[PDB]
Symmetry: D2
């Protein structure tokens, strides 16, 4: 036990708002990181049913608000899905309309069902189909909706709200007159900045985020097929392409990156771990994944977590069909702050034991 002299010294230190470093929990400087976030897998059958169920059970108040957010069991206090990333599933009918606002939190919206979905980002209107995603970067006036001719749409939102909050950098304001006014032609952004290695001769665009705000499923699929003709990709991800800011080559946003990967028929990757958090969405196909020993058998439009520094591998159970996983992450924040670390699994042939 401590000496009456020591216990008097710690008490003296507290009086001046100080302490002894030998008195704290030994993992103030840990040998390696250990995630507080736990691996979770969300079944599309459950999500579609419970989100649509919300329409008839929601009050006149709390318009939306009406989101089924993915709560990590170990991340309940900050309502995050993985690490410092927020994710919610939401729905709207044709003609429905949410007012414009801006926040310091960056966001992306990945459509998983329906047609007619749109987003105005700083006057640039963008229409989205299944497996397309739109960017709404930090500080931009954005609003969402469904076109009048559209169907009922269901999408996933990914934000860095928890990161924005914990860093004490959060800001919010509603549009001074509810909705943005713009005469800029529809889909101007993807149509002008969406060409392969191609940019307007005069680039009047000087913002640190991507000028391309919509990333299309079809051309991305087409490009992965092309990548399949010339490379095997990585041992840990297969044919993996990351989305870019075409002005810089860097990530689409300052805090968030996104990727799309293709797994060949019967392919089973090796396992690795890294310092970022990753949230996967199954854009196409059927298979399973092992993350932290736990097995997740996934189908089209399922969602699953991979916490930081957690062993993870992927597998396509289809016999003659490729599988495509969309994913977004906090990679840019890792890379910019020099915290990016990666390590392969040496045990087995590079594969986790499933219990």
């Amino acid at each position: 036990r401590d000496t009456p002299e020591l216990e008097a010294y710690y008490d003296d230190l507290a009086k001046i708002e100080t302490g002894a470093l030998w008195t704290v929990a030994n993992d103030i400087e840990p040998w390696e990181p250990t995630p507080k976030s736990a691996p979770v897998h969300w079944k599309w059958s459950d999500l579609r049913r419970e989100v649509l169920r919300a329409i008839d059970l929601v009050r006149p108040e709390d318009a939306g608000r009406r989101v089924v957010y993915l709560r990590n069991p170990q991340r309940k206090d900050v309502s995050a899905a993985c690490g410092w990333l927020f994710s919610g599933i939401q729905t709207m009918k044709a003609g429905e309309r949410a007012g414009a606002h801006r926040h310091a939190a960056s966001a992306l919206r990945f459509i998983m069902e329906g047609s007619g979905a749109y987003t105005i980002v700083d006057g640039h209107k963008v229409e989205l189909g299944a497996n397309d995603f739109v960017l709404t970067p930090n500080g931009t006036w954005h609003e969402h909706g469904i076109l009048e001719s559209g169907t009922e749409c269901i999408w996933q939102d990914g934000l860095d709200i928890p990161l924005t909050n914990c860093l004490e950098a959060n800001f919010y304001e509603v549009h001074p007159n509810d909705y943005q006014t713009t005469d800029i032609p529809l889909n101007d952004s993807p149509l002008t900045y969406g060409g392969p290695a191609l940019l307007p001769q005069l680039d009047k665009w000087d913002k640190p985020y991507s000028p391309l705000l919509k990333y299309s499923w079809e051309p991305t699929y087409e490009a992965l097929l092309n990548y399949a003709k010339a490379s095997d990709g990585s041992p840990y991800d297969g044919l993996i392409l990351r989305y870019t800011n075409p002005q810089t080559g860097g990530h689409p946003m300052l805090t968030m990156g996104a990727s799309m990967q293709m797994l060949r028929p019967g392919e089973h990757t090796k396992a690795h771990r890294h310092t970022g958090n990753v949230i996967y969405n199954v854009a196409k196909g059927q298979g399973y994944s092992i993350v932290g020993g736990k097995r997740f058998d996934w189908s089209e439009h399922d969602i699953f977590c991979v916490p930081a520094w957690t062993w993870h591998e992927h597998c396509n159970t289809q016999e003659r069909d490729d599988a495509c996983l969309f994913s977004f992450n906090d990679f840019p924040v890792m890379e910019k702050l020099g915290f990016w670390a990666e390590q392969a699994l040496e045990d087995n042939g590079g594969h986790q034991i499933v219990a």
Copy 2:
């Protein structure tokens, strides 16, 4: 007051079964309009600080000798042991003979000398010598050891670390040197002597690290730079004549996560109040005066330490009649700047001065 329907409550429980929830059930948005400081402003008098740090020598056990450091503990940040925001700060003491072993960690560190002479650090083979008000960098993942040269005196210094940030972001690594100490034949002070020149770099620059090649930042030349700056400008209305330390190779910040500044307040100067999104820890390098942080007045003198939480009104004052005052600071800024979270705002009311809340 009014409980919502059993239908809704069945739905909430159904959502919990698949590890989800209804967003309208939370409550609360912690005010998304503007940041809420999680740290409290705190002052640390050098009188108390120095006196309590020396006491640790005779009280520390056989073990805990390597951990013999008094850390600045923010009363609202005890859970993560931060001094302010996601920044760690500690006070150490070593004597003429003493030296420590070398380790490497993901966290970045600053070592600002407060008292003494002939302190030294080895960073990846680069040996640097330090005096009062000088500081060194021990950046991400670099081999670093501390000690005092034979000809030196008893030293007291302040450590600055982004430890809470690194743990928080789940990215901290640690390993001791396999040989306990580093073996280096590189000439002494090679870094500040090759990279410390005013707007000058070696013609063939072989440095390939994202952080500064200049690892020691010297008090004397910094002070002389501020005297010169004073001849041509009044600087910022909110800090006086304020220069930030830089990475001479890129012109950016010294380290990827922490920035550092030195500022000179003219005799009798009272600065204007402002807010910003970073967390800043101040060490008084020279002089005497006060500061008002979030309503609280901190009368400081040489080597006092105080911090300013994010989005908190702050202003600085030099009480002296003839002599200038200098405030060293290290901060959170590179993380706010790179992630696009930087914001600043001036106090409009009361002539740019806070109402002092006793």
Copy 3:
């Protein structure tokens, strides 16, 4: 008229003895107010071009077989053999079987296919296949060889080189491959298939060259990109809908010295005239019309070549009623942009159209 004093003339000769002169003796400042084009605008009809290039096959000796190329010679730039400014351009022909050896040089090159199918180039092991209106890069100091695949036809292509610039700046190097040809097992078209995706890069990018990882730029997807661009904009008043090719890894230009553009002119479009500091060489990828360069009218059609000297008024027109016209171009721009020499100016007079000087 009036000779200056023998005292002055003794002084001038004294200055020459130490290899100097009096600045007031020159005369002339070549007009320092604005640039003077050193190149003349020139048109090259495909009819003549193709016809004269094929003739070279039977006329060339045993030697000179490797040099069998008709270069575009600017009449006011014969001394340095440039097509326009400091840019070289030539026309080559190869048949289904033929292939050349590999060499490496400091100059950068573009190879734009004008006629034929199944052309190929190896760049540092990267094998690419080319069709009409596609082009490849053979950047600074890279191992490159050209040829036609077995299944291909007779090909005619245009080479674009910064040879005059490199000689002018005294920096050109040359060496043949020690093994005559390159040995590569890398899968065909690996570069455009891994780097040709719309806003997509391999998660682990291992390319570490200052120039583009994407070496083949394809006509078909470029054309489809312009049709899409047309749905949302009218582009520039001076070029119509104009996209430049980029380095997908940095977002900058494809090579450190040469830029390249493709532009689509809507049916019946007459563009506005402008000046700029670069030199541009145009190849007609699709359609028919005319252009006015420095007063001269050039009625062009598919695969005609013309250049625009620096600081020369130029405008483009599409004569067709239903179909769009496309103009490929490669240019000097990266050198003007990086050295801070870029300047542009619009024609104010005559509704933005030049007076055509017959």
Copy 4:
């Protein structure tokens, strides 16, 4: 000889402004560069005498204009000193004054004698002493003069006029009202941006050239002495420091770089060659240099050329005194356009044979 068929073919090619590549001089693509510029050495005794001599022999017309430009024998047509660089020696008395103008050509002015010399660059006034140099970068309003209390001053001008001209990028205009109007404090630039690894917290300066426009001799000398305590420098240059843009770490200007080197007592460097042109000015000391086999015995304030791809080495003949060479160059244009190449001499111990 050529066949009547061939000579008719070349004639046909000329009619359409074309030629045969096998008919041109073989060194269109040379194996390596060979400089047209020749090594030259200008003696300070000659320069001081002939420049001062110009005052009494110049007409009322041609005010200045009154410059003794260093003409390379092989570069007479473009009036360059080396490669594409212009250099002239000029003088002014106290109170003398040249009007403000701007040009696309970048320039630097290296003071070699006298006191009171000044330059206003875009409102920023800068005073210069011996061995100090001021930048007047592309497109900036600049004017020169000597303070009323100053002495007779002699300086060297270094410009990239020939480069600006050959690239067809030259522009010029006189100030709409002759002289710049500014209330910005004297020496504001060196005093605010001249600190070692130190910049103002808010940097309102967004120009691609250096915010530090004056580089001082004394602190640069002081820094070379410090560099001498910890390194041997390069085998080919000794203790060589290059001047920087302190906002970027890059070169002070877009087309021009500058360096200052210290040679230790009795030091004799090895020889190398590179793709840039370099013009040296002897800021302090006495010694010799070998460039292209030719020996140049230099003294304080001498000037000498080193053409591109020409072997060059340096030597301090002083027994117990360091020698300092100032130099400026076209290195940034080489580096930015990827034309930078360097090669050591292997013959001898790395030393040229003097004939």
